[PDB]
Short mmCIF file of C-alpha atoms and ligand atoms in Angstrom, two decimals:
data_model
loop_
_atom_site.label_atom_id
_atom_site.label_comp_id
_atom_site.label_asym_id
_atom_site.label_seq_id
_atom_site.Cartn_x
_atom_site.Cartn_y
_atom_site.Cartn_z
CA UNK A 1 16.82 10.68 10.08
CA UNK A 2 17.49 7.72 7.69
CA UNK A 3 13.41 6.84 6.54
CA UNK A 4 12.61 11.01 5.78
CA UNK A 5 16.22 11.54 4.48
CA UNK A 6 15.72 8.48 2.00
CA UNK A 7 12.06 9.64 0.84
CA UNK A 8 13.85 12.74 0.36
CA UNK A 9 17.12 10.95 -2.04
CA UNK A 10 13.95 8.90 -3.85
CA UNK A 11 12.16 12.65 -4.45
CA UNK A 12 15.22 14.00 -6.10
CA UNK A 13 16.18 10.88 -8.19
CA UNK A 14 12.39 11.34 -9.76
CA UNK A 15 13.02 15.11 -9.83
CA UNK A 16 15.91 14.70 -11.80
CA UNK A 17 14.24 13.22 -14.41
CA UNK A 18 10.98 15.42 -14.77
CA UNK A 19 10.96 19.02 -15.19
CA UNK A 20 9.99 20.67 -11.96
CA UNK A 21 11.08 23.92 -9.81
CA UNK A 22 12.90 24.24 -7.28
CA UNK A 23 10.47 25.68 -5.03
CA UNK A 24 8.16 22.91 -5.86
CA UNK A 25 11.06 20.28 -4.65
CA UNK A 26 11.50 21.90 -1.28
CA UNK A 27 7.83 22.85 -0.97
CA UNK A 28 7.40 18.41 -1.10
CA UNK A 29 9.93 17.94 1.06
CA UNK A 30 8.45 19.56 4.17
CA UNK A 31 5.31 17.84 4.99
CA UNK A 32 2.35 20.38 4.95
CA UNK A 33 1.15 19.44 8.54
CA UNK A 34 2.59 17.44 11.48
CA UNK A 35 0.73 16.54 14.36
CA UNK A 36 2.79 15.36 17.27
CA UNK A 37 -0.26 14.48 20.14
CA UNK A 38 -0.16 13.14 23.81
CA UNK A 39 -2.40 10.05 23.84
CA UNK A 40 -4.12 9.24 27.28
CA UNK A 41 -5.68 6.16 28.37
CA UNK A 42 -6.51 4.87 31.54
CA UNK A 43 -5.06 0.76 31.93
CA UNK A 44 -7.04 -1.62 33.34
CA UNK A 45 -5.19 -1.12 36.69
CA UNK A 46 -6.53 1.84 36.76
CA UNK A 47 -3.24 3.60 35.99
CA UNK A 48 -3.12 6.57 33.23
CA UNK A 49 -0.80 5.79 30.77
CA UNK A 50 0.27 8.22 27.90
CA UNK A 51 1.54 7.36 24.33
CA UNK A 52 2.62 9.81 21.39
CA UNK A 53 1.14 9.89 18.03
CA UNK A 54 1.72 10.83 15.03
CA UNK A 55 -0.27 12.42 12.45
CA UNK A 56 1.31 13.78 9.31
CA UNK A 57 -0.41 15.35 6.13
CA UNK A 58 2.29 15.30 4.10
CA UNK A 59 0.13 17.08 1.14
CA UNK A 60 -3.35 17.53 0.35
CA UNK A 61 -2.96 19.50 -3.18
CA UNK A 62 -5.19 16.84 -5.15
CA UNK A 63 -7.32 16.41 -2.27
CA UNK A 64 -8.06 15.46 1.16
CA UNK A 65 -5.00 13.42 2.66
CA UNK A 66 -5.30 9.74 2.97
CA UNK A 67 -2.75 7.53 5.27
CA UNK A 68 -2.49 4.48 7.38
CA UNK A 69 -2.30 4.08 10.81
CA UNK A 70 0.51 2.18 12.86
CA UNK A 71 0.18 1.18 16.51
CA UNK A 72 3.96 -0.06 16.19
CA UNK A 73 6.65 0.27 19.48
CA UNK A 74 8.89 1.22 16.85
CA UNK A 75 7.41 4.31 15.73
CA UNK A 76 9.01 7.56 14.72
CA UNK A 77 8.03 10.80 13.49
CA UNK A 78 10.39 10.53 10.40
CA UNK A 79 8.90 6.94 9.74
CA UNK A 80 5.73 8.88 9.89
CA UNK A 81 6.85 11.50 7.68
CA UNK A 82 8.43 9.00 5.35
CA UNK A 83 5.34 7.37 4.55
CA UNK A 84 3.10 10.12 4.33
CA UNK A 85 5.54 10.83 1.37
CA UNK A 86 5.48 7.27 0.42
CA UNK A 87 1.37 7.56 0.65
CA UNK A 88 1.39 11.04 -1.68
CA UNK A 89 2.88 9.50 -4.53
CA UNK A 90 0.83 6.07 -3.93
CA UNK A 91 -3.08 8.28 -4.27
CA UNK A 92 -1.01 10.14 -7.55
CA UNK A 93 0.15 7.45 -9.22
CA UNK A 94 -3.39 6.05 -9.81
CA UNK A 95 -4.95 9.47 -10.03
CA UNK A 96 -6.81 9.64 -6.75
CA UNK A 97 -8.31 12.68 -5.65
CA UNK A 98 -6.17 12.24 -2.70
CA UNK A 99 -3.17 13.71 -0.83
CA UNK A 100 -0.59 11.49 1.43
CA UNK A 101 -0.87 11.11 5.35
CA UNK A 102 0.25 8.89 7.50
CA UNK A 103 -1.09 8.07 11.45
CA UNK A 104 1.13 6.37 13.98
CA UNK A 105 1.10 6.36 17.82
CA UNK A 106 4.15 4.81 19.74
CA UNK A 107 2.46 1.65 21.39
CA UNK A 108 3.40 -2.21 21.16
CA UNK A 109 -0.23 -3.56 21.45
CA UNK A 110 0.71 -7.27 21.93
CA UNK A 111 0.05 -6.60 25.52
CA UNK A 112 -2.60 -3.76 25.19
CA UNK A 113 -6.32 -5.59 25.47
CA UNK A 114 -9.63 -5.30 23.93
CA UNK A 115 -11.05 -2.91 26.35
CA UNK A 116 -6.86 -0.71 26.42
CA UNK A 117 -6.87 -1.12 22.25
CA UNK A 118 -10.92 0.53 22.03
CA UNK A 119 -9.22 3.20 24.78
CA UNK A 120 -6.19 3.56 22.57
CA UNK A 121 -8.45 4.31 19.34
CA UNK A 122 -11.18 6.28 20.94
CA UNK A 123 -8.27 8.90 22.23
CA UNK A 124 -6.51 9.06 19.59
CA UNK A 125 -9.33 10.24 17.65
CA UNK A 126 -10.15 12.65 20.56
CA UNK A 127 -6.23 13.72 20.20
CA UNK A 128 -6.42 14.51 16.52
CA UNK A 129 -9.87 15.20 15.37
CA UNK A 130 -9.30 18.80 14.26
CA UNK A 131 -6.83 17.72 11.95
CA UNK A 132 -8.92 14.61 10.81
CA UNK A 133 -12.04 14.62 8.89
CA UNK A 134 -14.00 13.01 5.40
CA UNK A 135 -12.93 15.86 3.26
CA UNK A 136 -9.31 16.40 4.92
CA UNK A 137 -7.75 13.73 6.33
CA UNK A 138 -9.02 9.96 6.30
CA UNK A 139 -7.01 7.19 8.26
CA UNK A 140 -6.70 3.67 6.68
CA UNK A 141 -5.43 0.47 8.21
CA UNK A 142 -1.91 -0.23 8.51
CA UNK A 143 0.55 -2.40 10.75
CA UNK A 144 -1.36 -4.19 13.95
CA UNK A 145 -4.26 -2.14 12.99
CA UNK A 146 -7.04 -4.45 12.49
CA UNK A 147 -10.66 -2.79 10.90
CA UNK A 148 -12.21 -3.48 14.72
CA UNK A 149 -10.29 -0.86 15.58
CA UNK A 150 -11.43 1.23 12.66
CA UNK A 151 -15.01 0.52 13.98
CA UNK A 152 -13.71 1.86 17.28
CA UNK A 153 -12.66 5.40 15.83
CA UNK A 154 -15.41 5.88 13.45
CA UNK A 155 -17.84 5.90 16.29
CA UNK A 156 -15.53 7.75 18.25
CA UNK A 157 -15.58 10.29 15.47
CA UNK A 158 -19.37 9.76 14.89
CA UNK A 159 -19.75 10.60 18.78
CA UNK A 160 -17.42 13.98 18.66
CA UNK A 161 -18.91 15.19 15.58
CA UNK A 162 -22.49 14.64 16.32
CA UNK A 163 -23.65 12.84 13.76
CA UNK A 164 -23.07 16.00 11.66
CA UNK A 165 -21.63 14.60 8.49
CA UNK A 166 -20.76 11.67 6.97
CA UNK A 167 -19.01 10.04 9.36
CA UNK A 168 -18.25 6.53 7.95
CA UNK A 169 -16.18 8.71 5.63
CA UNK A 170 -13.41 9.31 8.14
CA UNK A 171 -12.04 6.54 7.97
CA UNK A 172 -11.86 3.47 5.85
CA UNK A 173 -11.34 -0.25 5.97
CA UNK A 174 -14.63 -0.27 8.23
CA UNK A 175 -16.18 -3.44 9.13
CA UNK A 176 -18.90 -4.11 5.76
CA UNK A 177 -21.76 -4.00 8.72
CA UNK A 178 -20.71 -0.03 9.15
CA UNK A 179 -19.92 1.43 6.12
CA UNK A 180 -16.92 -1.20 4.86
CA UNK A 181 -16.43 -2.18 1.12
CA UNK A 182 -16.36 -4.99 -0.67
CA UNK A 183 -12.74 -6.34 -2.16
CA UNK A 184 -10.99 -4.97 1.08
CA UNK A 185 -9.16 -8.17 2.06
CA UNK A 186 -7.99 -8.89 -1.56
CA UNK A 187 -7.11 -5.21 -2.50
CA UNK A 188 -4.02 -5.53 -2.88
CA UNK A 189 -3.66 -8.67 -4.34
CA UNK A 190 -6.23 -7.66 -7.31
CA UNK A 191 -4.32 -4.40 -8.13
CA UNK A 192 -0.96 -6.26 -8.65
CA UNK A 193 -2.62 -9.23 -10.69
CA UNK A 194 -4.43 -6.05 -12.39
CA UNK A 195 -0.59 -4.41 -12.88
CA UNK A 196 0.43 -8.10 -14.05
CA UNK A 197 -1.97 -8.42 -17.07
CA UNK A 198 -1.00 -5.11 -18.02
CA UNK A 199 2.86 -5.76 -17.95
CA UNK A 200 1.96 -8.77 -20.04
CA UNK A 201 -0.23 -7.27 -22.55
CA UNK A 202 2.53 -4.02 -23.01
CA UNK A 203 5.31 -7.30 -23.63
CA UNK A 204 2.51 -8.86 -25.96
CA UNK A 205 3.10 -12.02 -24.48
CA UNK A 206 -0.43 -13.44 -23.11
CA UNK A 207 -0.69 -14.82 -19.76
CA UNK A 208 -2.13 -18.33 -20.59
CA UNK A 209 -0.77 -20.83 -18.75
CA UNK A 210 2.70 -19.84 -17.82
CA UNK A 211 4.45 -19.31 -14.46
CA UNK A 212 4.33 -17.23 -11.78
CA UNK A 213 6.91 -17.46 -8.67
CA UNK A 214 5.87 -15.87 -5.19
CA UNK A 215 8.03 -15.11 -2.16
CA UNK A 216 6.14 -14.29 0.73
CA UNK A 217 3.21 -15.73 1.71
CA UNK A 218 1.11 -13.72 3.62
CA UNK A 219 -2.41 -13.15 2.95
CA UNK A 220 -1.56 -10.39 0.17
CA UNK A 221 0.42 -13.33 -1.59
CA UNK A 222 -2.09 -16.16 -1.13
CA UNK A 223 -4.25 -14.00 -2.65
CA UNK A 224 -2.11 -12.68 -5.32
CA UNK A 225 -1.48 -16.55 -6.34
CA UNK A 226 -5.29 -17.43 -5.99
CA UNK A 227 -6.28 -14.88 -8.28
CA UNK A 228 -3.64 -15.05 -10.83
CA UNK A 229 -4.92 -18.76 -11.35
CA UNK A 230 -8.42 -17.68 -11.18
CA UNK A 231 -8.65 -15.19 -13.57
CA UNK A 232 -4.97 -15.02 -15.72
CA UNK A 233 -4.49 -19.03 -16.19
CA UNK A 234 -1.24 -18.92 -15.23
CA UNK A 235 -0.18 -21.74 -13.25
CA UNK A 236 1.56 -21.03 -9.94
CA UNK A 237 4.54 -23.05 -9.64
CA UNK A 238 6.15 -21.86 -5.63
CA UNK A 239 4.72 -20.67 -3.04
CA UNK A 240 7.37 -19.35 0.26
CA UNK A 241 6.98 -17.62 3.25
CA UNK A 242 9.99 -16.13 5.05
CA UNK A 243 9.98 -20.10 6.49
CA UNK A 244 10.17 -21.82 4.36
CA UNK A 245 9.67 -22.81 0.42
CA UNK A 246 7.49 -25.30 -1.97
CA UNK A 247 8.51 -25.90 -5.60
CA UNK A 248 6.24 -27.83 -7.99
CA UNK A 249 7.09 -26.87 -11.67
CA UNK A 250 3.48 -29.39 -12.31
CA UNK A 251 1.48 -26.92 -10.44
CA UNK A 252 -0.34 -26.16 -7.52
CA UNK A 253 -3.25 -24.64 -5.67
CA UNK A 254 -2.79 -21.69 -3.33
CA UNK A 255 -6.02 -22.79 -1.53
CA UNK A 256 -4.29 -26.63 -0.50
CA UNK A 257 -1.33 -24.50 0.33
CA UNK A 258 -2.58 -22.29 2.57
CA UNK A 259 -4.82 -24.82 3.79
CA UNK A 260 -1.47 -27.39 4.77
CA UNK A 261 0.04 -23.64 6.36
CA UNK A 262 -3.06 -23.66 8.58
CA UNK A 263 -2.80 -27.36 9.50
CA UNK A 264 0.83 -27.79 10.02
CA UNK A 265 1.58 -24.65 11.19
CA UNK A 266 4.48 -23.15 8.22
CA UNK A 267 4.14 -23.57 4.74
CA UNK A 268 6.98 -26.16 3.86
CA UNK A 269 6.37 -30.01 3.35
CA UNK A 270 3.99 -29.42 1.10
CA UNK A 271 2.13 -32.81 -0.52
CA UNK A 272 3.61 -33.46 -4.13
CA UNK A 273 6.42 -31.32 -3.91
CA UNK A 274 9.81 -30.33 -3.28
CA UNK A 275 10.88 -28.02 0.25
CA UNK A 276 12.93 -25.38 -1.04
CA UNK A 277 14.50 -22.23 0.13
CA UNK A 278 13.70 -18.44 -0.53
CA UNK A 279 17.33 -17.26 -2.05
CA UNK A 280 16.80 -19.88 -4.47
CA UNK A 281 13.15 -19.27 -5.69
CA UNK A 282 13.86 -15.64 -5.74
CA UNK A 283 16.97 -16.76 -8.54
CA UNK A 284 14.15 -19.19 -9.65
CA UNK A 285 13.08 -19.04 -13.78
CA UNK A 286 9.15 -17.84 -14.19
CA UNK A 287 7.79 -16.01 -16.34
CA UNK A 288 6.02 -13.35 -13.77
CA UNK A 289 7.63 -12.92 -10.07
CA UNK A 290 5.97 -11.59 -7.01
CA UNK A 291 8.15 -10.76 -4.03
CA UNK A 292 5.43 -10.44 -1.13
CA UNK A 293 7.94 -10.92 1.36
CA UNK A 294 10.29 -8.70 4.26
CA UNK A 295 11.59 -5.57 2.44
CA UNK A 296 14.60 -5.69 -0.24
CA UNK A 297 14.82 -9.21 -0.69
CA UNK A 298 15.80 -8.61 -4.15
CA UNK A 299 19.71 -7.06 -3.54
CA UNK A 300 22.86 -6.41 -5.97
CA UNK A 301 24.18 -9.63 -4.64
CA UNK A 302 21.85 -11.68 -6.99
CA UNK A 303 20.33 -8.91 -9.28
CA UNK A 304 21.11 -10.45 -12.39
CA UNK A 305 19.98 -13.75 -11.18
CA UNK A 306 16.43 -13.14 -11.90
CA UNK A 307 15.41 -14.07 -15.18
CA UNK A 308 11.20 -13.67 -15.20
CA UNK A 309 10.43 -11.16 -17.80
CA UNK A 310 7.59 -9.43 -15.41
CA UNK A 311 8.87 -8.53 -11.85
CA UNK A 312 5.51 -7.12 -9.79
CA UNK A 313 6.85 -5.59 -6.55
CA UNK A 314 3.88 -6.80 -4.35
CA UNK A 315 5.36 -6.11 -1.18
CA UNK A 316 6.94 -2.13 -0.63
CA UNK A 317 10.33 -1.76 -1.46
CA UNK A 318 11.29 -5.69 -1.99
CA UNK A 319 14.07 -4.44 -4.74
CA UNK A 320 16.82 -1.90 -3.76
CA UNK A 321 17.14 0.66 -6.21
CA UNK A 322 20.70 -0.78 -7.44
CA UNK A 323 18.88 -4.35 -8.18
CA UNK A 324 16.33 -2.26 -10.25
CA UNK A 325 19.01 -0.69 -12.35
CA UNK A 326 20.46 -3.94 -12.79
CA UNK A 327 17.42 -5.85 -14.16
CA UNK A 328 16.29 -2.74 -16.03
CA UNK A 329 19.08 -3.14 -18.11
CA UNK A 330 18.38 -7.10 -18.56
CA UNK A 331 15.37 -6.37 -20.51
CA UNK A 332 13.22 -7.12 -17.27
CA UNK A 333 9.91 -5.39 -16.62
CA UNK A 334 9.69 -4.31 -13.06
CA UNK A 335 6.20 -3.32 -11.84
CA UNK A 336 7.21 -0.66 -8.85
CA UNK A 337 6.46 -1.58 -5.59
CA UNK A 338 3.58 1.87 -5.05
CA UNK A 339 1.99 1.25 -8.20
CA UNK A 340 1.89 -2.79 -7.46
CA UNK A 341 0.43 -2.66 -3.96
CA UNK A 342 -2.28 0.69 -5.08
CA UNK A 343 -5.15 -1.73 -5.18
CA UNK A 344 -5.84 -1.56 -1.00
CA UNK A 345 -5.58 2.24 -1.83
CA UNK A 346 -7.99 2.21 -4.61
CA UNK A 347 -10.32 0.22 -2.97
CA UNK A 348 -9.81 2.19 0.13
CA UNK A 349 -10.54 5.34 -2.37
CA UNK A 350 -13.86 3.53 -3.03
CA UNK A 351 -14.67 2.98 0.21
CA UNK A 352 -14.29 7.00 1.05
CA UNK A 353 -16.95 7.23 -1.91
CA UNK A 354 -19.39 4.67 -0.88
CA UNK A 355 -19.28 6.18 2.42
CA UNK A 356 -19.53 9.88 1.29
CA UNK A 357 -22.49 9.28 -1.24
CA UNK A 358 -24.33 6.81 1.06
CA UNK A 359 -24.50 4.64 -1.47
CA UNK A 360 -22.86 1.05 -1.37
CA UNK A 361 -21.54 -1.03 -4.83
CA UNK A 362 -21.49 -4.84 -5.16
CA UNK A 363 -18.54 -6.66 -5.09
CA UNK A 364 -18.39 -6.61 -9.21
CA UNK A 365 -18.82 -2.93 -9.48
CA UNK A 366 -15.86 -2.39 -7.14
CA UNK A 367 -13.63 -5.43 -8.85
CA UNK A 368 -14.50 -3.17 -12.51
CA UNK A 369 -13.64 0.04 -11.35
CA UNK A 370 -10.39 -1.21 -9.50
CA UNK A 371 -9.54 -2.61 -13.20
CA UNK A 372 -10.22 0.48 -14.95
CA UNK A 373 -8.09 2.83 -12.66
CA UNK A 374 -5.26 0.05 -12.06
CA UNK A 375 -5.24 -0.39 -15.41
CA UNK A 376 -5.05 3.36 -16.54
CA UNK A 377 -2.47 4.06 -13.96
CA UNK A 378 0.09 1.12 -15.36
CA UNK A 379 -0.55 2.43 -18.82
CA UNK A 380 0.07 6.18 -17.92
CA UNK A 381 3.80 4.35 -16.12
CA UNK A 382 4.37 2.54 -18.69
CA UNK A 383 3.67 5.15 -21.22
CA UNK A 384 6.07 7.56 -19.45
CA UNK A 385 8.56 4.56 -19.12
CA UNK A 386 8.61 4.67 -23.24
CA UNK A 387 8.36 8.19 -23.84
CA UNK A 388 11.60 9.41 -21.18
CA UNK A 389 13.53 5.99 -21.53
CA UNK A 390 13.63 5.77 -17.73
CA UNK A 391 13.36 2.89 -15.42
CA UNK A 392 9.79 1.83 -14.30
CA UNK A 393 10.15 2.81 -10.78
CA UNK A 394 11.33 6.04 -12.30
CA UNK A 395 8.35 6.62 -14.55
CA UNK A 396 5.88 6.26 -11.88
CA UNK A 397 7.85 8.59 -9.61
CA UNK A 398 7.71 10.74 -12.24
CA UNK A 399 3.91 10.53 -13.22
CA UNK A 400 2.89 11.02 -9.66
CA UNK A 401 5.21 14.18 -8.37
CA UNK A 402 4.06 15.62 -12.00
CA UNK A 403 0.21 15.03 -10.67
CA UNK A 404 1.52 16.45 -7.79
CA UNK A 405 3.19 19.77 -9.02
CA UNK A 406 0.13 20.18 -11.38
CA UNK A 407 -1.85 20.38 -8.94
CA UNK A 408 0.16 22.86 -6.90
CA UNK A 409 0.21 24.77 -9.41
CA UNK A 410 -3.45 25.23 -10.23
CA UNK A 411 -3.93 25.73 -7.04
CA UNK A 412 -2.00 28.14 -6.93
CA UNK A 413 0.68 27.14 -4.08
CA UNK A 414 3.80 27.59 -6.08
CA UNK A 415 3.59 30.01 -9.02
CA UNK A 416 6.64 28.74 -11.31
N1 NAP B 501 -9.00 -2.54 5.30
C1 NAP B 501 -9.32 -3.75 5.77
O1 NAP B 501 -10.49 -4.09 5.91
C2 NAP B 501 -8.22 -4.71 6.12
C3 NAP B 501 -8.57 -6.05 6.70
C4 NAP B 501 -7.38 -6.84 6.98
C5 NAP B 501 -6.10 -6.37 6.72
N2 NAP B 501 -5.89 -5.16 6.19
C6 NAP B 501 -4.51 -4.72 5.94
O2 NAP B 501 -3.82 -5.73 5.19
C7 NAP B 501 -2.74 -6.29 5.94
C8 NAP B 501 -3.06 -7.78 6.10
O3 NAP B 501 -3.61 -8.00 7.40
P1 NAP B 501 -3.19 -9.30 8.25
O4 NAP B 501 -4.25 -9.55 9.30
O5 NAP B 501 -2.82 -10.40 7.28
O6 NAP B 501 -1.85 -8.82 8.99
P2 NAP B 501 -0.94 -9.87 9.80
O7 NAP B 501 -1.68 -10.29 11.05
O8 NAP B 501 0.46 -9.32 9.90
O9 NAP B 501 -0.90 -11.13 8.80
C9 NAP B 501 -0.17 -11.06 7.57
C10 NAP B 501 0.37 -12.45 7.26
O10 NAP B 501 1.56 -12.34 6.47
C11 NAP B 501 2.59 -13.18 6.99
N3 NAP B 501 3.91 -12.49 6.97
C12 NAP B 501 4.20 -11.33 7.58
N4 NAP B 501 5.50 -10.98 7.35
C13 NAP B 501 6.05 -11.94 6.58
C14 NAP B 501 7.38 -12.19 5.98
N5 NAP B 501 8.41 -11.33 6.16
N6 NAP B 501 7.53 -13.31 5.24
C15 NAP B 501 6.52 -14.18 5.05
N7 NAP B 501 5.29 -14.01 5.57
C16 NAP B 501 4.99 -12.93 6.33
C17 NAP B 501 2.21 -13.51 8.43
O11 NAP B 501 2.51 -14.88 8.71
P3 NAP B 501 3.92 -15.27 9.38
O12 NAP B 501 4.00 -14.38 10.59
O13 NAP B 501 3.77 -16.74 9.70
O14 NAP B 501 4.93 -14.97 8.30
C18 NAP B 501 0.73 -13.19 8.54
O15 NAP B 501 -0.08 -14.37 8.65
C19 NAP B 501 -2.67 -5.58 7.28
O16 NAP B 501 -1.37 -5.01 7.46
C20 NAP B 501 -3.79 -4.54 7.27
O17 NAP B 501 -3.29 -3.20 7.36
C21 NAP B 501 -6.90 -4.34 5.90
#
């Protein structure tokens, strides 16, 4: 199926470039453990209705799995599969104790209510609890998963397991009153501002008061933009969502724009500047660029286009592989999509610990560590990135099926 048959191509385009067996390559691409279950939930009609879910743990060699979950219509097992994959590499790249998985049930909630969505969570949980756990398997939130419906399955698990363990460790994004964490809405956002201070410092060009373009403007963006101003000094100069676009080479303030979003209801007209379109501000001279937008909006069509010496792939997959090529070989310095978005993983990761430890950091102790281990995960890509004279994307593939293999082999799962 085209999502697993593409993680698959993207394995063997990093295995080509890193030394690694063969048994190790087709030991990755089976996923260690699949979990197709029948979900049951009785409507508010009274009717029984059944859905299928998905739970794959696609690895756990560095540790216990970790992997979204998506209530989408559209799910599929090989979407399923494809991310677990996609979620292995994301824990490796930034050296989490982690292995992928990935948790999906086939269900449009738009119509499902409060009372069918609790239902929903509370039997999925009952579905796949012996594959689930703290120290094996920990869900995260993903597509139309919102963290009430974390709260929903952690007590579901809480209630099965009898109050046994540590519960709050099953899952993560929790609400803060039950076991959440700090830095959970901005995760992602801080992680690629993290990535884009270390892009600049490996250029040695500073970060004070320059230009940074966004496209997409979603909460990961706004935030992105926010704390790019806040903490680099760079001065955003466009803001877009998939509506619409503002361009104001004086400057601008993410909070006014999201503020006039709110108010009008899209993005565009902003006060004090010009309504412009997404194809052009993706062409548009910056100095950093932050695609935060629908996937592959960066495309062969305009590769070359792009002139901003730091590209940080906010948003997964935003560049196809042949517009990576193509502005690796313009001197551009492309920040790969996994590594990018690792910050709601990391802080996810520190979530699992605050949970497991009983033990809960402030807000500053979470923002620090996220900086260390961002920042030690860019250097190790960038490092390779020097060392193998491979593309960026390619180093970090490479880093994190190395992790990967290594720890195979120690533990013994493939012997070459
Ligand atoms: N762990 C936690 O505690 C936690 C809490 C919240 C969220 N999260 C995670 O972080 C994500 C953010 O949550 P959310 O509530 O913002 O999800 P959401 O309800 O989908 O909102 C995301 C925003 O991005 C915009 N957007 C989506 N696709 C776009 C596109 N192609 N172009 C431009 N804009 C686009 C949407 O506005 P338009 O539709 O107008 O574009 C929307 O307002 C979620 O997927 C969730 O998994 C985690």
């Amino acid at each position: 199926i085209d999502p697993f048959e593409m993680a698959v191509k993207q394995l063997e385009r990093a295995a080509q470039y890193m030394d690694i067996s063969e048994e190790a390559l087709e030991w990755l691409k089976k996923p260690m453990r699949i979990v197709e279950v029948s979900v049951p939930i009785e409507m508010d009609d009274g009717s029984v209705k059944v859905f299928t879910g998905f739970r794959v743990q696609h690895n756990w060699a560095r540790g216990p799995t970790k992997g979204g979950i998506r209530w989408h219509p559209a799910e599929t097992l090989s979407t399923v599969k494809a991310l677990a994959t996609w979620m292995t590499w994301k824990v490796a790249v930034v050296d989490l104790p982690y292995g992928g998985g990935k948790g999906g049930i086939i269900v449009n909630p738009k119509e499902l209510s409060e009372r069918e969505q609790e239902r929903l969570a509370r039997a999925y949980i009952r579905a796949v609890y012996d594959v689930i756990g703290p120290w094996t398997d920990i869900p995260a939130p993903d597509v139309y998963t919102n963290p009430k419906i974390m709260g929903w399955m952690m007590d579901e698990y809480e209630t099965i397991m009898r109050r046994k363990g540590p519960a709050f460790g099953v899952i993560t994004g929790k609400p803060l009153s039950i076991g959440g964490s700090l830095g959970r809405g901005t995760a992602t956002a801080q992680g690629a501002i993290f990535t884009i201070r270390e892009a600049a410092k490996a250029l040695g060009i500073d970060l004070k008061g320059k230009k940074i373009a966004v496209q997409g403007y979603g909460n990961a963006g706004y935030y992105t933009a926010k704390l790019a101003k806040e903490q680099l000094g760079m001065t955003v100069v466009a803001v877009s969502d998939s509506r619409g676009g503002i361009y104001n080479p004086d400057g601008l303030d993410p909070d006014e724009v999201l503020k006039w979003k709110r108010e009008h209801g899209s993005v565009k007209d902003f006060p004090g500047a010009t309504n412009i379109t997404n194809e052009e501000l993706l062409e548009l001279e910056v100095d950093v660029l932050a695609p935060a937008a629908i996937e592959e909006v960066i495309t062969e069509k305009n590769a070359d286009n792009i002139k901003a010496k730091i590209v940080a792939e906010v948003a997964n997959g935003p560049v196809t592989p042949e517009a990576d090529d193509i502005l690796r070989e313009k001197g551009i310095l492309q920040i790969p999509d996994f590594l990018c978005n690792a910050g709601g993983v990391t802080v996810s990761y520190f979530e699992w610990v605050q949970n497991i430890n009983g033990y809960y950091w402030t807000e500053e102790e979470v923002r620090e560590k996220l900086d260390k281990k961002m920042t030690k995960a860019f250097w190790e890509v960038y490092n390779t990135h020097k060392d193998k004279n491979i593309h960026m994307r390619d180093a970090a593939y490479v880093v994190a099926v190395s992790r990967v293999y290594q720890a195979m082999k120690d533990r013994g799962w493939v012997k070459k």
